[PDB]
Design a protein around this nucleic acid. Structure first.
Length: 95
RNA sequence: AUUGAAAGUUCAAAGCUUAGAUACCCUGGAGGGAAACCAGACUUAACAC
């Protein structure tokens, strides 16, 4: 599956269509400090077999919660932890 | 120094009378209130350890 996903991802990246319509001068490069856009990174595509969907969904909280006992066991110092989630877990209410 | 001299074409007189800018005549024909748009984003805090 990871191979199939990298296949489709690469296909559109270089092999497929081309820069044909990106050469049109209607696009507009983003301002770096006033804009935020997202894009796919081919490297970050972990795949694991499930065997149980409900428990997986319930463990996502262990993954993404600052006090979840999976990121606690993968990251310490807690600060980067907050940082990590704040940079990768959407908005959070820090004050 | 004459086929001359003298002699007001003058007077009275309403461009008036009758007479409908009227008759017939569709603001109508054609024309998409549409086009675009995620009911979504995210967990945090406390103390115990």
């Amino acid at each position: 599956l990871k191979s199939k996903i990298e296949s489709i991802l690469d296909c559109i990246k270089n092999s497929c269509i081309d820069t044909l319509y990106i050469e049109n001068n209607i696009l507009s490069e983003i301002d770096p400090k006033k804009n935020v856009v997202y894009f796919i990174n081919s490297d970050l595509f972990e795949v694991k077999r499930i065997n149980d969907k409900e428990k997986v969904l319930a463990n996502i909280y262990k993954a993404v919660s600052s006090e979840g006992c999976c990121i606690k066991s993968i990251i310490t110092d807690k600060y980067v932890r907050k940082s990590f989630l704040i940079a990768f877990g959407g908005y959070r209410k820090v004050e």
